[PDB]
Amino acid sequence: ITKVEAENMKIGGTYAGKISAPFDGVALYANADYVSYSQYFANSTHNISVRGASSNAGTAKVDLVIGGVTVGSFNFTGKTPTVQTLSNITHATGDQEIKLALTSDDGTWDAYVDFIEFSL
Ligand SMILES: [Ca+2]
Ligand SMILES: [Mg+2]
């Protein structure tokens, strides 16, 4: 299992920044916010989990982008952190950018991101 902490990734956008609550991680608030890093892959398919939370009782949605492809979105509804999963995602091998960003600007609340975990 490969786990990467959001707070150790590149943080970009107008608003995004490291957080300590509701965990050590990064918050994403508006469309151009992101976290990213480069991951080497030997295999073309993984299960991907992210621990995250919403800023509010309602929904925050986070796109997962691998090598520029939006492969799916994690739904974090409510203030309590959960682990959300995208299973059996195929992608390119070798060095690939991994990026997390809000799915919308106005459609959803803000996302808190703790870590990402890849597994086979
Ligand atoms: Ca973390
Ligand atoms: Mg927002």
Side-chain angles (χ1 to χ4, degrees):
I1 285 149
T2 288
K3 181 174 180 182
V4 179
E5 297 291 347
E7 60 271 32
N8 294 333
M9 298 180 187
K10 185 178 175 52
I11 302 170
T14 297
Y15 302 99
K18 292 183 186 189
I19 61 177
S20 52
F23 38 61
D24 297 302
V26 178
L28 306 172
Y29 307 91
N31 274 177
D33 287 342
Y34 66 90
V35 291
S36 67
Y37 78 100
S38 294
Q39 177 66 59
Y40 174 77
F41 292 120
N43 205 293
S44 52
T45 292
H46 291 79
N47 303 131
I48 311 115
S49 289
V50 170
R51 182 168 188 248
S54 180
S55 60
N56 285 245
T59 302
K61 279 185 167 249
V62 178
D63 283 347
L64 175 61
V65 193
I66 301 177
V69 181
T70 297
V71 300
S73 148
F74 299 106
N75 179 148
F76 301 106
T77 293
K79 298 174 81 64
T80 298
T82 68
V83 174
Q84 296 292 323
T85 300
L86 290 168
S87 293
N88 308 304
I89 300 289
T90 299
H91 54 77
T93 64
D95 298 304
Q96 298 299 331
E97 179 193 69
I98 310 305
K99 179 173 72 172
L100 294 164
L102 292 178
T103 304
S104 79
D105 204 37
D106 295 358
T108 80
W109 293 110
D110 301 324
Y112 305 137
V113 182
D114 184 358
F115 61 77
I116 189 160
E117 195 198 4
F118 291 89
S119 59
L120 296 167

PDB file of all heavy atoms in Angstrom, residues 6-37:
ATOM      1  N   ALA A   6      -1.586  14.427   2.109  1.00  0.00           N
ATOM      2  CA  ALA A   6      -1.885  15.613   1.323  1.00  0.00           C
ATOM      3  C   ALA A   6      -0.968  16.778   1.680  1.00  0.00           C
ATOM      4  O   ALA A   6      -0.549  17.547   0.809  1.00  0.00           O
ATOM      5  CB  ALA A   6      -3.343  16.007   1.503  1.00  0.00           C
ATOM      6  N   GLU A   7      -0.669  16.912   2.976  1.00  0.00           N
ATOM      7  CA  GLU A   7       0.146  17.994   3.474  1.00  0.00           C
ATOM      8  C   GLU A   7       1.602  17.909   2.987  1.00  0.00           C
ATOM      9  O   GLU A   7       2.340  18.879   3.173  1.00  0.00           O
ATOM     10  CB  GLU A   7       0.059  18.076   4.999  1.00  0.00           C
ATOM     11  CG  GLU A   7       0.505  16.844   5.779  1.00  0.00           C
ATOM     12  CD  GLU A   7      -0.585  15.800   6.056  1.00  0.00           C
ATOM     13  OE1 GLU A   7      -1.517  15.636   5.220  1.00  0.00           O
ATOM     14  OE2 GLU A   7      -0.508  15.100   7.087  1.00  0.00           O
ATOM     15  N   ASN A   8       2.000  16.796   2.368  1.00  0.00           N
ATOM     16  CA  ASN A   8       3.321  16.657   1.774  1.00  0.00           C
ATOM     17  C   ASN A   8       3.337  16.849   0.258  1.00  0.00           C
ATOM     18  O   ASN A   8       4.390  16.732  -0.374  1.00  0.00           O
ATOM     19  CB  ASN A   8       3.921  15.301   2.140  1.00  0.00           C
ATOM     20  CG  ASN A   8       4.199  15.182   3.615  1.00  0.00           C
ATOM     21  OD1 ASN A   8       4.428  16.192   4.299  1.00  0.00           O
ATOM     22  ND2 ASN A   8       4.207  13.964   4.118  1.00  0.00           N
ATOM     23  N   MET A   9       2.188  17.155  -0.326  1.00  0.00           N
ATOM     24  CA  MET A   9       2.059  17.366  -1.763  1.00  0.00           C
ATOM     25  C   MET A   9       2.300  18.826  -2.117  1.00  0.00           C
ATOM     26  O   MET A   9       2.364  19.700  -1.251  1.00  0.00           O
ATOM     27  CB  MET A   9       0.650  16.944  -2.212  1.00  0.00           C
ATOM     28  CG  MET A   9       0.363  15.478  -1.988  1.00  0.00           C
ATOM     29  SD  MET A   9      -1.309  15.122  -2.540  1.00  0.00           S
ATOM     30  CE  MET A   9      -1.492  13.427  -1.973  1.00  0.00           C
ATOM     31  N   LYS A  10       2.412  19.100  -3.414  1.00  0.00           N
ATOM     32  CA  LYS A  10       2.395  20.466  -3.898  1.00  0.00           C
ATOM     33  C   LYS A  10       0.974  21.017  -3.722  1.00  0.00           C
ATOM     34  O   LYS A  10       0.004  20.324  -4.030  1.00  0.00           O
ATOM     35  CB  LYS A  10       2.794  20.526  -5.367  1.00  0.00           C
ATOM     36  CG  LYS A  10       2.917  21.896  -5.915  1.00  0.00           C
ATOM     37  CD  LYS A  10       3.367  21.877  -7.358  1.00  0.00           C
ATOM     38  CE  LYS A  10       3.394  23.238  -7.989  1.00  0.00           C
ATOM     39  NZ  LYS A  10       4.161  24.174  -7.151  1.00  0.00           N
ATOM     40  N   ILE A  11       0.870  22.232  -3.196  1.00  0.00           N
ATOM     41  CA  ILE A  11      -0.406  22.884  -2.925  1.00  0.00           C
ATOM     42  C   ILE A  11      -0.482  24.079  -3.826  1.00  0.00           C
ATOM     43  O   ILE A  11       0.426  24.922  -3.821  1.00  0.00           O
ATOM     44  CB  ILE A  11      -0.498  23.299  -1.453  1.00  0.00           C
ATOM     45  CG1 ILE A  11      -0.328  22.115  -0.518  1.00  0.00           C
ATOM     46  CG2 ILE A  11      -1.820  24.014  -1.199  1.00  0.00           C
ATOM     47  CD1 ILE A  11      -0.160  22.463   0.927  1.00  0.00           C
ATOM     48  N   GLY A  12      -1.554  24.219  -4.597  1.00  0.00           N
ATOM     49  CA  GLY A  12      -1.716  25.351  -5.460  1.00  0.00           C
ATOM     50  C   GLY A  12      -3.116  25.894  -5.463  1.00  0.00           C
ATOM     51  O   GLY A  12      -4.031  25.309  -4.896  1.00  0.00           O
ATOM     52  N   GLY A  13      -3.260  27.027  -6.121  1.00  0.00           N
ATOM     53  CA  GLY A  13      -4.518  27.751  -6.211  1.00  0.00           C
ATOM     54  C   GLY A  13      -4.559  28.963  -5.303  1.00  0.00           C
ATOM     55  O   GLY A  13      -3.683  29.209  -4.466  1.00  0.00           O
ATOM     56  N   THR A  14      -5.634  29.727  -5.435  1.00  0.00           N
ATOM     57  CA  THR A  14      -5.816  30.957  -4.682  1.00  0.00           C
ATOM     58  C   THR A  14      -5.929  30.749  -3.193  1.00  0.00           C
ATOM     59  O   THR A  14      -5.425  31.574  -2.415  1.00  0.00           O
ATOM     60  CB  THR A  14      -7.044  31.705  -5.204  1.00  0.00           C
ATOM     61  OG1 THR A  14      -6.812  32.073  -6.558  1.00  0.00           O
ATOM     62  CG2 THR A  14      -7.291  33.025  -4.452  1.00  0.00           C
ATOM     63  N   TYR A  15      -6.617  29.689  -2.781  1.00  0.00           N
ATOM     64  CA  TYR A  15      -7.019  29.579  -1.388  1.00  0.00           C
ATOM     65  C   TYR A  15      -6.415  28.383  -0.662  1.00  0.00           C
ATOM     66  O   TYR A  15      -6.372  28.389   0.580  1.00  0.00           O
ATOM     67  CB  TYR A  15      -8.547  29.454  -1.276  1.00  0.00           C
ATOM     68  CG  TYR A  15      -9.279  30.587  -1.893  1.00  0.00           C
ATOM     69  CD1 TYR A  15      -9.825  30.464  -3.174  1.00  0.00           C
ATOM     70  CD2 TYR A  15      -9.452  31.807  -1.226  1.00  0.00           C
ATOM     71  CE1 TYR A  15     -10.502  31.490  -3.764  1.00  0.00           C
ATOM     72  CE2 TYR A  15     -10.135  32.842  -1.798  1.00  0.00           C
ATOM     73  CZ  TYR A  15     -10.680  32.671  -3.085  1.00  0.00           C
ATOM     74  OH  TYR A  15     -11.365  33.664  -3.686  1.00  0.00           O
ATOM     75  N   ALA A  16      -6.008  27.336  -1.383  1.00  0.00           N
ATOM     76  CA  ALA A  16      -5.658  26.074  -0.742  1.00  0.00           C
ATOM     77  C   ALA A  16      -4.499  26.256   0.227  1.00  0.00           C
ATOM     78  O   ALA A  16      -3.557  27.021  -0.026  1.00  0.00           O
ATOM     79  CB  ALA A  16      -5.293  25.043  -1.777  1.00  0.00           C
ATOM     80  N   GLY A  17      -4.542  25.506   1.314  1.00  0.00           N
ATOM     81  CA  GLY A  17      -3.481  25.549   2.300  1.00  0.00           C
ATOM     82  C   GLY A  17      -3.556  24.400   3.262  1.00  0.00           C
ATOM     83  O   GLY A  17      -4.596  23.738   3.408  1.00  0.00           O
ATOM     84  N   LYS A  18      -2.443  24.163   3.947  1.00  0.00           N
ATOM     85  CA  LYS A  18      -2.361  23.149   4.974  1.00  0.00           C
ATOM     86  C   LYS A  18      -3.333  23.447   6.107  1.00  0.00           C
ATOM     87  O   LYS A  18      -3.514  24.597   6.504  1.00  0.00           O
ATOM     88  CB  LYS A  18      -0.946  23.069   5.544  1.00  0.00           C
ATOM     89  CG  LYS A  18       0.107  22.556   4.618  1.00  0.00           C
ATOM     90  CD  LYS A  18       1.451  22.447   5.321  1.00  0.00           C
ATOM     91  CE  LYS A  18       2.586  22.062   4.416  1.00  0.00           C
ATOM     92  NZ  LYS A  18       3.821  21.755   5.174  1.00  0.00           N
ATOM     93  N   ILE A  19      -3.905  22.377   6.638  1.00  0.00           N
ATOM     94  CA  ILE A  19      -4.811  22.428   7.771  1.00  0.00           C
ATOM     95  C   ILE A  19      -4.343  21.469   8.848  1.00  0.00           C
ATOM     96  O   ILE A  19      -3.601  20.510   8.582  1.00  0.00           O
ATOM     97  CB  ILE A  19      -6.264  22.087   7.355  1.00  0.00           C
ATOM     98  CG1 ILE A  19      -6.366  20.664   6.780  1.00  0.00           C
ATOM     99  CG2 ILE A  19      -6.779  23.137   6.387  1.00  0.00           C
ATOM    100  CD1 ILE A  19      -7.767  20.225   6.406  1.00  0.00           C
ATOM    101  N   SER A  20      -4.816  21.731  10.075  1.00  0.00           N
ATOM    102  CA  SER A  20      -4.624  20.847  11.204  1.00  0.00           C
ATOM    103  C   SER A  20      -5.927  20.245  11.707  1.00  0.00           C
ATOM    104  O   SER A  20      -5.871  19.231  12.411  1.00  0.00           O
ATOM    105  CB  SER A  20      -3.956  21.617  12.346  1.00  0.00           C
ATOM    106  OG  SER A  20      -4.650  22.803  12.633  1.00  0.00           O
ATOM    107  N   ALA A  21      -7.068  20.821  11.360  1.00  0.00           N
ATOM    108  CA  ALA A  21      -8.386  20.296  11.709  1.00  0.00           C
ATOM    109  C   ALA A  21      -9.193  20.191  10.417  1.00  0.00           C
ATOM    110  O   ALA A  21      -9.112  21.065   9.558  1.00  0.00           O
ATOM    111  CB  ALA A  21      -9.094  21.201  12.700  1.00  0.00           C
ATOM    112  N   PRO A  22      -9.981  19.108  10.273  1.00  0.00           N
ATOM    113  CA  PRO A  22     -10.210  18.029  11.227  1.00  0.00           C
ATOM    114  C   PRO A  22      -9.145  16.910  11.210  1.00  0.00           C
ATOM    115  O   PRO A  22      -9.347  15.864  11.809  1.00  0.00           O
ATOM    116  CB  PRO A  22     -11.571  17.475  10.802  1.00  0.00           C
ATOM    117  CG  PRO A  22     -11.578  17.664   9.295  1.00  0.00           C
ATOM    118  CD  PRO A  22     -10.853  18.987   9.088  1.00  0.00           C
ATOM    119  N   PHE A  23      -8.022  17.177  10.533  1.00  0.00           N
ATOM    120  CA  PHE A  23      -6.846  16.318  10.539  1.00  0.00           C
ATOM    121  C   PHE A  23      -5.735  17.167   9.926  1.00  0.00           C
ATOM    122  O   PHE A  23      -5.978  18.235   9.372  1.00  0.00           O
ATOM    123  CB  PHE A  23      -7.065  14.997   9.763  1.00  0.00           C
ATOM    124  CG  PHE A  23      -7.888  15.161   8.511  1.00  0.00           C
ATOM    125  CD1 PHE A  23      -7.450  15.991   7.476  1.00  0.00           C
ATOM    126  CD2 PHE A  23      -9.106  14.527   8.376  1.00  0.00           C
ATOM    127  CE1 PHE A  23      -8.225  16.177   6.337  1.00  0.00           C
ATOM    128  CE2 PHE A  23      -9.878  14.692   7.223  1.00  0.00           C
ATOM    129  CZ  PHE A  23      -9.444  15.533   6.220  1.00  0.00           C
ATOM    130  N   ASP A  24      -4.495  16.661  10.018  1.00  0.00           N
ATOM    131  CA  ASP A  24      -3.403  17.263   9.269  1.00  0.00           C
ATOM    132  C   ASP A  24      -3.597  16.920   7.791  1.00  0.00           C
ATOM    133  O   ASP A  24      -3.719  15.747   7.423  1.00  0.00           O
ATOM    134  CB  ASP A  24      -2.065  16.784   9.793  1.00  0.00           C
ATOM    135  CG  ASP A  24      -1.869  17.221  11.238  1.00  0.00           C
ATOM    136  OD1 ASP A  24      -1.917  18.444  11.482  1.00  0.00           O
ATOM    137  OD2 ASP A  24      -1.782  16.403  12.154  1.00  0.00           O
ATOM    138  N   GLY A  25      -3.680  17.939   6.959  1.00  0.00           N
ATOM    139  CA  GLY A  25      -4.021  17.728   5.564  1.00  0.00           C
ATOM    140  C   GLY A  25      -4.020  19.036   4.832  1.00  0.00           C
ATOM    141  O   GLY A  25      -3.284  19.968   5.196  1.00  0.00           O
ATOM    142  N   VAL A  26      -4.844  19.125   3.782  1.00  0.00           N
ATOM    143  CA  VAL A  26      -4.973  20.320   2.979  1.00  0.00           C
ATOM    144  C   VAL A  26      -6.456  20.571   2.737  1.00  0.00           C
ATOM    145  O   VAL A  26      -7.224  19.619   2.519  1.00  0.00           O
ATOM    146  CB  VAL A  26      -4.202  20.204   1.640  1.00  0.00           C
ATOM    147  CG1 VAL A  26      -4.375  21.446   0.776  1.00  0.00           C
ATOM    148  CG2 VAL A  26      -2.727  19.953   1.910  1.00  0.00           C
ATOM    149  N   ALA A  27      -6.847  21.852   2.729  1.00  0.00           N
ATOM    150  CA  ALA A  27      -8.197  22.250   2.357  1.00  0.00           C
ATOM    151  C   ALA A  27      -8.211  22.803   0.937  1.00  0.00           C
ATOM    152  O   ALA A  27      -7.308  23.550   0.518  1.00  0.00           O
ATOM    153  CB  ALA A  27      -8.717  23.318   3.303  1.00  0.00           C
ATOM    154  N   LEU A  28      -9.290  22.460   0.230  1.00  0.00           N
ATOM    155  CA  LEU A  28      -9.591  22.914  -1.126  1.00  0.00           C
ATOM    156  C   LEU A  28     -10.925  23.659  -1.077  1.00  0.00           C
ATOM    157  O   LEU A  28     -11.925  23.108  -0.580  1.00  0.00           O
ATOM    158  CB  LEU A  28      -9.712  21.716  -2.065  1.00  0.00           C
ATOM    159  CG  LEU A  28      -8.521  20.757  -2.092  1.00  0.00           C
ATOM    160  CD1 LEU A  28      -8.869  19.531  -2.912  1.00  0.00           C
ATOM    161  CD2 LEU A  28      -7.266  21.427  -2.617  1.00  0.00           C
ATOM    162  N   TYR A  29     -10.937  24.891  -1.568  1.00  0.00           N
ATOM    163  CA  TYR A  29     -12.076  25.788  -1.372  1.00  0.00           C
ATOM    164  C   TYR A  29     -12.752  26.257  -2.647  1.00  0.00           C
ATOM    165  O   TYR A  29     -13.938  26.639  -2.633  1.00  0.00           O
ATOM    166  CB  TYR A  29     -11.654  27.062  -0.625  1.00  0.00           C
ATOM    167  CG  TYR A  29     -10.922  26.840   0.682  1.00  0.00           C
ATOM    168  CD1 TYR A  29      -9.537  26.747   0.716  1.00  0.00           C
ATOM    169  CD2 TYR A  29     -11.602  26.787   1.894  1.00  0.00           C
ATOM    170  CE1 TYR A  29      -8.839  26.629   1.912  1.00  0.00           C
ATOM    171  CE2 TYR A  29     -10.915  26.662   3.094  1.00  0.00           C
ATOM    172  CZ  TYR A  29      -9.537  26.592   3.098  1.00  0.00           C
ATOM    173  OH  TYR A  29      -8.856  26.498   4.297  1.00  0.00           O
ATOM    174  N   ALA A  30     -12.007  26.334  -3.750  1.00  0.00           N
ATOM    175  CA  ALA A  30     -12.515  26.932  -4.970  1.00  0.00           C
ATOM    176  C   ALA A  30     -11.905  26.252  -6.160  1.00  0.00           C
ATOM    177  O   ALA A  30     -10.955  25.468  -6.040  1.00  0.00           O
ATOM    178  CB  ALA A  30     -12.199  28.405  -4.989  1.00  0.00           C
ATOM    179  N   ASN A  31     -12.449  26.436  -7.339  1.00  0.00           N
ATOM    180  CA  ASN A  31     -12.039  25.655  -8.467  1.00  0.00           C
ATOM    181  C   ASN A  31     -10.535  25.382  -8.871  1.00  0.00           C
ATOM    182  O   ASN A  31     -10.262  24.245  -9.238  1.00  0.00           O
ATOM    183  CB  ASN A  31     -12.850  26.177  -9.669  1.00  0.00           C
ATOM    184  CG  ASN A  31     -14.198  25.506  -9.768  1.00  0.00           C
ATOM    185  OD1 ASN A  31     -15.000  25.863 -10.659  1.00  0.00           O
ATOM    186  ND2 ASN A  31     -14.469  24.521  -8.942  1.00  0.00           N
ATOM    187  N   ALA A  32      -9.548  26.262  -8.964  1.00  0.00           N
ATOM    188  CA  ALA A  32      -8.123  26.385  -9.174  1.00  0.00           C
ATOM    189  C   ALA A  32      -7.316  25.896  -7.997  1.00  0.00           C
ATOM    190  O   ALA A  32      -6.111  25.753  -8.114  1.00  0.00           O
ATOM    191  CB  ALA A  32      -7.710  27.782  -9.533  1.00  0.00           C
ATOM    192  N   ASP A  33      -7.955  25.557  -6.834  1.00  0.00           N
ATOM    193  CA  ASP A  33      -7.236  24.921  -5.756  1.00  0.00           C
ATOM    194  C   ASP A  33      -6.886  23.487  -6.113  1.00  0.00           C
ATOM    195  O   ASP A  33      -7.681  22.790  -6.749  1.00  0.00           O
ATOM    196  CB  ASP A  33      -8.078  24.925  -4.466  1.00  0.00           C
ATOM    197  CG  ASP A  33      -8.188  26.298  -3.818  1.00  0.00           C
ATOM    198  OD1 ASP A  33      -7.355  27.200  -4.129  1.00  0.00           O
ATOM    199  OD2 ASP A  33      -9.100  26.462  -2.966  1.00  0.00           O
ATOM    200  N   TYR A  34      -5.727  23.014  -5.701  1.00  0.00           N
ATOM    201  CA  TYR A  34      -5.373  21.609  -5.923  1.00  0.00           C
ATOM    202  C   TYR A  34      -4.261  21.194  -4.987  1.00  0.00           C
ATOM    203  O   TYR A  34      -3.532  22.022  -4.445  1.00  0.00           O
ATOM    204  CB  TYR A  34      -4.927  21.369  -7.396  1.00  0.00           C
ATOM    205  CG  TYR A  34      -3.632  22.067  -7.771  1.00  0.00           C
ATOM    206  CD1 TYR A  34      -2.423  21.420  -7.588  1.00  0.00           C
ATOM    207  CD2 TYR A  34      -3.617  23.352  -8.278  1.00  0.00           C
ATOM    208  CE1 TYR A  34      -1.225  22.039  -7.902  1.00  0.00           C
ATOM    209  CE2 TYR A  34      -2.418  23.985  -8.615  1.00  0.00           C
ATOM    210  CZ  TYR A  34      -1.200  23.319  -8.440  1.00  0.00           C
ATOM    211  OH  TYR A  34      -0.042  23.925  -8.762  1.00  0.00           O
ATOM    212  N   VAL A  35      -4.118  19.856  -4.850  1.00  0.00           N
ATOM    213  CA  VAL A  35      -2.872  19.255  -4.396  1.00  0.00           C
ATOM    214  C   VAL A  35      -2.402  18.283  -5.461  1.00  0.00           C
ATOM    215  O   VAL A  35      -3.225  17.644  -6.137  1.00  0.00           O
ATOM    216  CB  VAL A  35      -2.980  18.514  -3.034  1.00  0.00           C
ATOM    217  CG1 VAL A  35      -3.205  19.519  -1.918  1.00  0.00           C
ATOM    218  CG2 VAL A  35      -4.073  17.460  -3.035  1.00  0.00           C
ATOM    219  N   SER A  36      -1.087  18.157  -5.629  1.00  0.00           N
ATOM    220  CA  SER A  36      -0.564  17.248  -6.632  1.00  0.00           C
ATOM    221  C   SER A  36       0.811  16.739  -6.275  1.00  0.00           C
ATOM    222  O   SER A  36       1.558  17.367  -5.524  1.00  0.00           O
ATOM    223  CB  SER A  36      -0.520  17.897  -8.000  1.00  0.00           C
ATOM    224  OG  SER A  36       0.415  18.944  -8.036  1.00  0.00           O
ATOM    225  N   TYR A  37       1.166  15.592  -6.853  1.00  0.00           N
ATOM    226  CA  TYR A  37       2.519  15.073  -6.761  1.00  0.00           C
ATOM    227  C   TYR A  37       2.693  14.068  -7.895  1.00  0.00           C
ATOM    228  O   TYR A  37       1.737  13.667  -8.549  1.00  0.00           O
ATOM    229  CB  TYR A  37       2.800  14.436  -5.381  1.00  0.00           C
ATOM    230  CG  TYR A  37       2.233  13.072  -5.212  1.00  0.00           C
ATOM    231  CD1 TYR A  37       3.058  11.959  -5.365  1.00  0.00           C
ATOM    232  CD2 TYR A  37       0.877  12.859  -4.979  1.00  0.00           C
ATOM    233  CE1 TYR A  37       2.563  10.675  -5.279  1.00  0.00           C
ATOM    234  CE2 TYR A  37       0.371  11.565  -4.896  1.00  0.00           C
ATOM    235  CZ  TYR A  37       1.211  10.472  -5.055  1.00  0.00           C
ATOM    236  OH  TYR A  37       0.682   9.220  -4.966  1.00  0.00           O
TER     237      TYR A  37
END
